[PDB]
Design a protein around this ligand. Structure first.
Ligand code: CLA
Ligand code: CLA
Ligand code: CLA
Ligand code: CLA
Ligand code: CLA
Ligand code: CLA
Ligand code: CLA
Ligand code: CLA
Ligand code: CLA
Ligand SMILES: CCCCCCCCCCCCCCCC(=O)OC[C@H](COP(=O)(O)OC[C@@H](O)CO)OC(=O)CCCCCCCCCCCCCCC
Lengths: 160, 737, 31, 80, 41, 86, 152
């Protein structure tokens, strides 16, 4: 009889299961194309994309819910707060990278695909790769915050 | 199928305590034996492994329970006939407080016999028996005396049946496992026939007597109930359709009975309760529905359903074999059935508590505020306790009766193979709800303290409107004439129709608005319920094994720990998960009852003047004051506790004494909860030393309480103290105002 | 004066961050 | 690893070595008791510190003793 | 019945009888001589 | 783990038609549930883009229509697929 | 006047307390017919209150500035009925109970299973021992002299 849920990769002794939420073709395609999962690309470029996307979002909540939301200084204060949060997150990423990775060691990413094919391990799991990722993320986040502020308060676009 | 004289009736076993257990029957070497005697008294499974004996033992105890209930009912009916002011209250329900208990003057305690009206002195009762008796047509004390006598006779009958069905004719195991016949009988006969009989009583007794009472007739001038039966002319005068007899019923001319079988809806303006004709029609329809439903399952005549056949046919691509095998589990285990029934009964009790306040079913009940509050709180607590017991017995079944080699079920097996995902998701949901429900109260407190009222989540600064509940209210308010054409008014006055019902200068019911505070309190309720469900479901799902202790099923259901190893293993058994969930159930129910009390006193209850202006008890401060913790501390706990702390020297001083007594009992429980056994066992050694010095050392060696016993004592005292404190506070507050 | 407008943020936001980062790097160190 | 010690009051009941949830303890021949046996503790790196062995000892005070000590991955029972 | 007499000598039943008689005696004593603050004799 | 639905898009048309056929009968005081829903849709587009009000009848018709439509679709999928497994 | 106190019979606040209590009781009686049972109960309560206040006045108690009696426990002969005599009576009764318990415990210590005589009491032996505690001081003192009171 047809059954949907199966053990992970056919091994019933590994602590996971394969469900439509995890292994649907649409879901599998969507996750494989996000920057965090492009193991064959320069980490700087993935970090720049992640920073751009995350910095663009942060402006909205700070602007709209902030203590100066009902004043003429709403946009500038919100954007400045978003930039500060981006700076704090960049500091956290740098600290994590320094703590976790040692210079000169090989990558610790897995080198086996789900079908058993051998692949080159991800370079994001090295000190140099994480440093590039963090420096891309900072530059991306600042650029996204600036773009959001520019669009919202330099061009009088019919938003809302 | 029964057995003739299986067990001899004798006093021999009375003189040998612990005869039900081999270990306990040896003798009391230490004091732990005495405690072990009471804890294992009703665990029939541990006594014997024969299912027939366990079933026979279980069947007989329910007869004793029924006998005790009948004795309680007999006492309740007798006290109303002998020590009550019911007949005076019946002539003026709005100005006389019901009372059915009186006190002997001994040590100055006759001060508790305060005035209640009608030339009577006693203790005011809040159980609502007066309204129950009034709605039944009871007028004199002779009827109550007869009812008490009948209840005593029924208690004696139940006791005799309990003795008989265990010592003279005990049914066989095949009799118990006939679930189809039991379901058919309990549906068609127990419920359907009972509903039909109550409908007949309401048709022939309650309707005419209550019509005479509502008309304003002196209760002593109303004809007796049997006069309406022997004299059809009286009923014809009251209801002309009775002149045609039962002919409209058999000719399908049912519309002629519209005089006493209505579909009005709303409340009776004179009494403030539901129309009795609607209740009679409701009971008739329910009796028909239950009588039809009792012909579903197969028996000796071949027609009907087989429960096993229905279960085996429900399977899917996600669940494998489905419900196959569940029929054998539920016909061989008493604990699983007990857990299921406990959960359903607790949910039903909570539903009943919610329903009785918004649709008052008894005359002069809505305007008796103390009775409403007491009934709501009582039934909420009962439902919570039953719900916790459900999980307890589910864990017991998982530990003891689970056996996949002979009782395999695919649905239960699949749940146990992904329990980590369930527990982790529930953990995240609980954390999210706690952050986004209680955090909004802390934000409000901080903003108010800092002097920034325009940054609060409130109806004036940042609104969080519960638009989903308001839509439901609007849909239910406009139902008559659109989606319920046969109805005249809405089901309840709370939906927001706009009408007000006032009885004797007091407000009975009116629309209840919803705003920002209701949003927050409802999410608080959701958070607490979710946390309780987390603690109980984790306890059930990890009863047999975990990554920490693979062999947990070998240690049993009720064990304290597995030692200080693995970093420490205190509270790993399934019993400890019920012990921890009792505290969260208490928390949730306390919050719910506080919400009910404040909302009712602020937005509903009050007095009405001649010009039509309503003055509520607390003046509608719930909307703006309940959005902060300081508001709850100040405008609810501080302000409304003045009644209970000023009750000394009056008839309400018993509540004042109980307030402090329950405080003491609650505080006394923390000694057992914060400390451990080794200290107390070491301390006893020094006390025993001086008893040996004076030759007064007992032969039964004193021992400290066990780890489980200490946990149980602590939780019991904690719950008793808290609930008693809230009880005294509520009663003292609501009787005065 | 204008000094509290500097020292209060300096002691509440900058010094805690520097101290926490240094302490985390110290406790995570191995050889 | 924890410390598990055996004292010469042991009677050779075997009850401690049957109770251990990980293989830490075993019986060896001896002279000094009627049973001609004593417990030995060769594998204390696999001890979790549960004290199931001490609950099983019939001697007045225990002939097996466990002293909790430096904790490792095995002694914490972590399967992460 | 010897067994019935044995059941009447168990600790809870005997304690209940003793305490009931004691409470009755104390209640009657306080009923005959109410509000005793000092021993006047 | 692939093609878990056993894709058969004939269900979408059959379910839609088997809902639209009975729901078009005008047994509600000369009007039909589908007709009422479509008239409600037409009325709320006259003030675009302002959303429907809380007291509008649009939400009730939407929920009641989609309940039956989803029931038809789900039962159609179960019936089409279950013919081959039982 | 010990500690600046005054006798109850001369205290005005005591009389004011009595008057307030009686007046509070009398306001409830006006709500009932004189022949009814609650009126009889209230009459009995008023009479008992008057009798209690008179008795407190007669016994020579001492009141403070609040009109409430105070107890002197320093050993003065004028107030021996407040603390000394009830104390001696309590000590006698407690010694009786303790001596009876000790005697029963010693009596059953020599049996084969002394524990079973503690959960199921031997009624005749206890009844025989119950009367013996009436002279507990003499027996206890003579046991102390003979050295049999303390375990060796
Ligand atoms: C099981 C429920 C129940 C409860 C809680 C009570 C409780 C009470 N009853 Mg009661 N009673 C009950 C059932 C119950 N009764 C039944 C079934 C009957 C027979 C129909 C009676 C008949 C009865 C009488 C006739 C009297 C009471 C009285 C009392 C009160 C004093 C009891 C007393 O002093 O006993 C002392 C303890 C004994 C063992 C005796 C007390 C509030 C008395 C009362 O209210 O006095 C004013 C009183 O006179 N009861
Ligand atoms: C089990 C319930 C029950 C019982 C025992 C009775 C018993 C009786 N009904 Mg009755 N009745 C009932 C339910 C019941 N009814 C219900 C639910 C309805 C509503 C349809 C009626 C409507 C009804 C009418 C209209 C009449 C009776 C009458 C009677 C009496 C003559 C037959 C008899 C005492 C007749 C009567 O009063 O004659 C004395 C009569 O005319 N009944
Ligand atoms: C229909 C309801 C129902 C039934 C039939 C049972 C039946 C059973 N339960 Mg149970 N239970 C229930 C509801 C029910 N439960 C609910 C609602 C809860 C949640 C609170 C529990 C929680 C629970 C636990 C936690 C345990 C059981 C256990 C048991 C089994 C042994 C019970 C026993 O020996 O009692 C012995 C009875 C007592 C010791 C009496 C307790 C008295 C209470 C706590 C205090 C009362 C205070 C009183 C007013 C003060 C007066 C004292 C007086 C001397 C002056 C038995 C099969 C046990 C079991 O199966 O173990 C394997 C077990 O451990 N139950
Ligand atoms: C008033 C005391 C108190 C408090 C605050 C809590 C709080 C909590 N208990 Mg708890 N508990 C308590 C007493 C308390 N308990 C008692 C007496 C018992 C009986 C032994 C239990 C038994 C118990 C059990 C059995 C369980 C919990 C769980 C939980 C957590 C639920 C999940 C969650 O996120 O909630 C929301 C969290 C909060 C409301 C706390 C945050 C407070 C606000 C938001 C301040 C936030 C400040 C913010 C972060 C900035 C601060 C930064 C700093 C520099 C200042 C929560 C942390 C459960 C758990 O582990 O999680 C699922 C669980 O299973 N409790
Ligand atoms: C989806 C929600 C809903 C619910 C819970 C009800 C519930 C009810 N409707 Mg109803 N109804 C609904 C939607 C709903 N309706 C809609 C959308 C329409 C079309 C506008 C109607 C049109 C309708 C009519 C015409 C009648 C009912 C009636 C009734 C009542 C009896 C029906 C029955 O079978 O018994 C019952 C309370 C009947 C009634 O009035 O009973 C008293 C009745 O005559 N309904
Ligand atoms: C006949 C019994 C008996 C006797 C002679 C004593 C005598 C004594 N106890 Mg003691 N005790 C008893 C029973 C008894 N106890 C019981 C049953 C308990 C458990 C509740 C205790 C718990 C206890 C504690 C916790 C302490 C003492 C202490 C003491 C010593 C200080 C004096 C005193 O009054 O302490 C006060 C004693 C009590 C408050 C005990 C309560 C009195 C009980 C209710 C009397 C029971 C009598 C018994 C039922 C006899 C039945 C007789 C019948 C069979 C004929 C004293 C030697 C203290 C001491 O010096 O430490 C070594 C101390 O700290 N006792
Ligand atoms: C243990 C002693 C002590 C304590 C508890 C404080 C506490 C405080 N000082 Mg402070 N201070 C101290 C010694 C101390 N000081 C000394 C020795 C000096 C140098 C003479 C200063 C100079 C100083 C200045 C100039 C200011 C404070 C301020 C403050 C307040 C804000 C915190 C801050 O900015 O820290 C700063 C703490 C230091 C620079 C001390 C370093 C040593 C806080 C109440 C600020 C204030 O008033 O806020 C309203 C502020 O502007 N302090
Ligand atoms: C309503 C009628 C009534 C009356 C007039 C009495 C009168 C009396 N009872 Mg009593 N009693 C009654 C009903 C009554 N009782 C009921 C219904 C019960 C519950 C079953 C009791 C239970 C009871 C107990 C338990 C005791 C009394 C005692 C007494 C006597 C106390 C005087 C004393 O100690 O002196 C000495 C006694 C006498 C002079 C004569 C006896 C007194 C004669 C006490 C008693 O007899 O003391 C020895 C006593 O201990 N009574
Ligand atoms: C060790 C504490 C203690 C002491 C020394 C006393 C002492 C006394 N109490 Mg008492 N009492 C106590 C605790 C105590 N009580 C507690 C805890 C309660 C609550 C249950 C009571 C409830 C109480 C009542 C209800 C009455 C007394 C009364 C009395 C007096 C008894 C008169 C008589 O002949 O007998 C006496 C002075 C009686 C009295 O009239 O006192 C003046 C009286 O009627 N007591
Ligand atoms: C996910 C959507 C709800 C679930 C849903 O689609 O329900 C229906 C779905 C499929 O059920 P089946 O048709 O396989 O089985 C029907 C049963 O009656 C057989 O016992 O259930 C599951 O796959 C398990 C869901 C567990 C809970 C999942 C998280 C919530």
């Amino acid at each position: 009889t047809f059954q949907v849920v199966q053990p992970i990769n056919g091994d019933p002794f590994i602590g996971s299961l394969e469900t439509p939420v995890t292994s649907s073709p649409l879901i599998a395609w969507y996750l494989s194309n996000l920057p965090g999962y492009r193991t064959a690309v320069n980490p700087l470029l993935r970090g720049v994309e992640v920073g751009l996307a995350h910095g663009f979002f942060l402006v909205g909540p700070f602007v709209k819910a902030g203590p100066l939301r009902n004043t003429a200084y709403a946009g500038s204060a919100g954007s400045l707060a978003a930039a500060g949060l981006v700076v704090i997150l960049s500091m956290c990423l740098t600290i994590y990278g320094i703590s976790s990775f040692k210079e000169g060691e090989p990558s610790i990413a897995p080198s086996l695909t789900l079908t058993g094919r051998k692949k080159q391990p991800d370079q994001l799991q090295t000190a140099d790769g994480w440093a590039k990722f963090t420096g891309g993320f900072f530059f991306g986040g600042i650029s996204g915050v600036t773009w959001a502020y520019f669009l919202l308060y330099v061009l009088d676009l019919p938003y809302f | 199928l029964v057995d003739r004289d299986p067990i001899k009736t004798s006093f021999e076993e009375w003189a040998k305590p612990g005869h039900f257990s081999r270990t306990i029957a040896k003798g009391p070497d230490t004091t732990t034996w005495i405690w072990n005697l009471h804890a294992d008294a009703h665990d029939f499974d541990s006594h014997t492994s024969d299912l027939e004996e366990i079933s026979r033992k279980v069947f007989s105890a329910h007869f004793g329970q029924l006998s005790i209930i009948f004795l309680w009912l007999s006492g309740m009916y007798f006290h109303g006939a002998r020590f009550s002011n019911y007949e005076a209250w019946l002539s003026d329900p709005t100005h006389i407080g019901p009372s059915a208990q009186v006190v002997w003057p001994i040590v100055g305690q006759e001060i508790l016999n305060g005035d209640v009206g009608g030339g009577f002195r006693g203790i005011q009762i809040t159980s609502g028996f007066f309204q129950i008796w009034r709605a039944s047509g009871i007028t004199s004390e002779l009827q109550l005396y007869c009812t008490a006598i009948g209840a005593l006779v029924f208690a004696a009958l139940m006791l005799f049946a309990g003795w008989f069905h265990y010592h003279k004719a005990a049914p066989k195991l095949a009799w118990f496992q006939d679930v189809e016949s039991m379901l058919n009988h309990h549906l068609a006969g127990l419920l359907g026939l009972g509903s039909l009989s109550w409908a007949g009583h309401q048709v022939h007794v309650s309707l005419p007597i209550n019509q005479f009472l509502n008309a304003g007739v002196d209760p002593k001038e109303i004809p007796l109930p049997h006069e309406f039966i022997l004299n059809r002319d009286l009923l014809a005068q009251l209801y002309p359709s009775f002149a045609e007899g039962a002919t409209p019923f058999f000719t399908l001319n049912w519309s002629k009975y519209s005089e006493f079988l209505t579909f009005r809806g709303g409340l009776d303006p004179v009494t403030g309760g539901l129309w009795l004709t609607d209740i009679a029609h409701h009971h008739l329809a329910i009796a028909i529905l239950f009588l039809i439903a009792g012909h579903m399952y197969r028996t000796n005549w071949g027609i009907g359903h087989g429960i096993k056949d229905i279960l085996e046919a429900h399977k899917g691509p996600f669940t494998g074999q489905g419900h196959k095998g569940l029929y054998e589990i539920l016909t061989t285990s008493w604990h699983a059935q007990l857990s299921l029934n406990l959960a359903m009964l607790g949910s039903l009790t909570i539903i009943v508590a919610h329903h009785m306040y918004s649709m008052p079913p008894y005359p002069y009940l809505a305007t008796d505020y103390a009775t409403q509050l007491s009934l709501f709180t009582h039934h909420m607590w009962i439902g919570g306790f039953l719900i916790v017991g459900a999980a307890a017995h589910a864990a017991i079944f998982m530990v003891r009766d689970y056996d996949p080699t002979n009782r395999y079920n695919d649905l239960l097996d699949r749940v146990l193979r992904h329990r980590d995902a369930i527990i982790s998701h529930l953990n995240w949901v609980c954390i999210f709800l706690g952050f986004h429900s209680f955090g909004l109260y802390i934000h409000n407190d901080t903003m108010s303290a800092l002097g920034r009222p325009q940054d609060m989540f409130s109806d004036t600064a940042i609104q969080l409107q519960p638009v989903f509940a308001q839509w439901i209210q609007n849909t239910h308010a406009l139902a008559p004439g659109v989606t319920a054409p046969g109805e005249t008014a809405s089901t309840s006055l709370t939906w927001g129709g706009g009408e007000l019902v006032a009885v004797g200068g007091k407000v009975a019911l009116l629309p209840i608005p919803l705003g920002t505070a209701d949003f927050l309190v409802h999410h608080i309720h959701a958070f607490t319920i979710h946390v309780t469900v987390l603690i109980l479901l984790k306890g059930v799902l990890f009863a047999r094994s975990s990554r920490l202790i693979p062999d947990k099923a070998n240690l049993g259901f009720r064990f304290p720990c597995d030692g200080p190893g693995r970093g420490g293993t205190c509270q790993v058994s399934a019993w400890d998960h019920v012990f921890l969930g009792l505290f969260w159930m208490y928390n949730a129910i306390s919050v719910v009852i506080f919400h009910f009390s404040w909302k009712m006193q602020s937005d509903v209850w009050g007095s009405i003047s001649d010009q039509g202006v309503v003055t509520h008890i607390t003046g509608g401060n719930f909307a703006q004051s309940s959005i902060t913790i300081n508001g709850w501390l100040r405008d609810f706990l501080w302000a409304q506790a003045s009644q209970v702390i000023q009750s000394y020297g009056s008839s309400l001083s018993a509540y004042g004494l109980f307030f402090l007594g329950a405080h003491f009992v609650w505080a006394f429980s923390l000694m057992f909860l914060f400390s451990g056994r080794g200290y107390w066992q070491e301390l006893i050694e020094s006390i025993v030393w001086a008893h040996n010095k004076l030759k007064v050392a007992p032969a039964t060696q004193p021992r400290a309480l066990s780890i489980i016993q200490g946990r149980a004592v602590g939780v019991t005292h904690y719950l008793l103290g808290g609930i008693a404190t809230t009880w005294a506070f509520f009663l003292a507050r609501i009787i005065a105002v | 004066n204008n000094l509290p407008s500097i020292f209060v943020p300096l002691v509440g936001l900058v010094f805690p961050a520097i101290a926490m980062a240094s302490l985390f790097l110290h406790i995570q160190k191995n050889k | 690893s924890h410390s598990v010690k055996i004292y010469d009051t042991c009677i050779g009941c075997t009850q401690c070595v049957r109770a251990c949830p990980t293989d830490v303890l075993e019986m060896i021949p001896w002279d000094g008791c009627k049973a001609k046996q004593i417990a030995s503790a060769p594998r204390t790196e696999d001890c979790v510190g549960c004290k199931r062995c001490e609950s099983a000892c019939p001697t007045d005070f225990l002939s097996v003793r466990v002293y909790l000590w430096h904790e490792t991955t095995r002694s914490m029972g972590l399967a992460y | 019945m010897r067994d019935l007499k044995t059941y009447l000598s168990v600790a809870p039943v005997l304690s209940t009888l003793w305490f009931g008689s004691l409470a009755g005696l104390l209640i009657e004593i306080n009923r005959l001589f109410p509000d005793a603050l000092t021993f006047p004799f | 783990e692939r093609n878990w639905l056993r894709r058969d898009l004939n269900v979408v048309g059959f379910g839609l038609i088997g809902w639209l056929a009975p729901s078009s009968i005008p047994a509600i005081n000369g009007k039909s549930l589908t007709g009422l829903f479509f008239d409600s849709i037409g009325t709320e587009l006259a003030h675009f883009p302002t959303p429907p009000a809380l007291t509008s009848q649009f939400w009730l018709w939407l929920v009641t229509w989609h309940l039956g439509l989803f029931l038809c679709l789900t039962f159609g999928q179960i019936g089409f697929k279950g013919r081959t497994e039982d | 006047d010990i500690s600046g106190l005054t006798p109850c019979k001369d205290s005005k606040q005591f009389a004011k307390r009595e008057k307030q209590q009686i007046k509070k009781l009398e306001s409830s009686l006006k709500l009932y017919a004189p022949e009814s049972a609650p009126a009889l109960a209230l009459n009995a309560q008023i009479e008992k209150t008057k009798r209690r206040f008179d008795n407190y006045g007669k016994y020579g108690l001492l009141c403070g500035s609040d009109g409430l009696p105070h107890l002197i426990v320093n050993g003065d002969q004028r107030h021996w009925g407040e603390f000394i005599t009830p104390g001696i009576l309590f000590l006698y009764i407690a010694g009786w109970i303790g001596w009876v318990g000790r005697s029963y415990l010693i009596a059953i210590s020599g049996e084969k299973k002394p524990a079973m005589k503690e959960i199921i009491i031997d009624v005749p032996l206890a009844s025989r021992i119950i009367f013996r505690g009436f002279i507990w001081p003499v027996a206890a003192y003579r046991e102390f002299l003979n050295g049999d009171l303390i375990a060796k």
